[PDB]
Design a protein around this ligand. Structure first.
Ligand SMILES: CC(=O)N[C@@H]1[C@@H](O)[C@H](O[C@@H]2O[C@H](CO)[C@H](O)[C@H](O)[C@H]2O[C@@H]2O[C@@H](C)[C@@H](O)[C@@H](O)[C@@H]2O)[C@@H](CO)O[C@@H]1O
Length: 219
């Protein structure tokens, strides 16, 4: 199998994990279906880097040093079912970055510096797994999970949820109403609807009473 240096390839799998890559390898085989780039030292993605990988189904970019995604970086990846961006340095994502990714089933974004739910995620109707843990989220916009009707795993822990602000009630009610899909991480997925906790009080978000919140406490 054609294969870049410091990767191992078999079939349509290109495995470049844990090989000290400082950049995405050149010449990634265009027939690739699974691409492991996780646990490297990749500090950026060049615009258009994945444009040729039209058959790609799974892309793992976790545990790198990414601070941004190029506009349209995943647009060619219409067959993509798994995307892992966890453990990077992402702050804000391009608004349209998920617009062509309706086939996506698993989207992992823990352990970044996200302060809002990225735009577009609410339209990814096929998601079964969505990981937002250990970011800087304070709330979830009203209705944002309403069409994610296939979800089985939602990771929301490790965020400083602002339980004083009335905007938290959407998430409060959502967690309360979907207890079976709220997951914590004990080195594995463990169902725990108390795992999303209020900033400061470290009380469960789902237990928050409407009356304890206020629409005047929403910076
Ligand atoms: C290629 C691959 O499978 N990578 C996985 C990676 O996604 C895992 O990260 C965990 O993902 C889940 C969602 O499925 C939760 O978001 C976990 O919090 C997350 O783990 C976090 O990152 C890892 C690297 C550790 O630091 C962990 O302690 C954090 O909570 C990891 C889990 O080990 O396996 C992979 O590398």
């Amino acid at each position: 199998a054609a294969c870049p240096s410091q990767c191992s390839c078999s079939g349509t799998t290109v495995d470049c994990r844990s090989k000290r890559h400082a950049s995405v390898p050149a010449g990634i085989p265009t027939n690739a279906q699974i691409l492991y780039l996780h646990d490297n030292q990749i500090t950026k993605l060049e615009p258009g880097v994945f444009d040729s990988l039209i058959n790609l189904k799974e892309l793992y970019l976790g545990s790198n040093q990414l601070g941004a995604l190029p506009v349209g970086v995943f647009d060619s990846l219409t067959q993509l079912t798994v995307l892992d961006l966890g453990t990077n340095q992402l702050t804000v994502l391009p608004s349209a970055v998920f617009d062509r990714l309706v086939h996506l089933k698993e989207l992992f974004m823990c352990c970044n510096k996200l302060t809002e739910l990225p735009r577009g995620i609410e339209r990814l109707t096929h998601l079964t797994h969505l990981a937002l843990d250990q970011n800087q989220l304070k709330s979830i916009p009203h209705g944002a999970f309403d069409r994610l009707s296939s979800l089985t795993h939602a990771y929301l822990f490790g965020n400083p949820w602002d339980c004083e602000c009335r905007d938290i009630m959407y998430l409060r009610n959502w967690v309360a109403d979907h207890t079976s899909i709220a997951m914590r991480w004990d080195g594995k997925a463990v169902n725990d609807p108390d795992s999303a906790k209020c900033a400061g009080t470290n009380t469960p978000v789902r237990a928050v009473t409407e009356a304890s919140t206020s629409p005047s406490k929403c910076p």
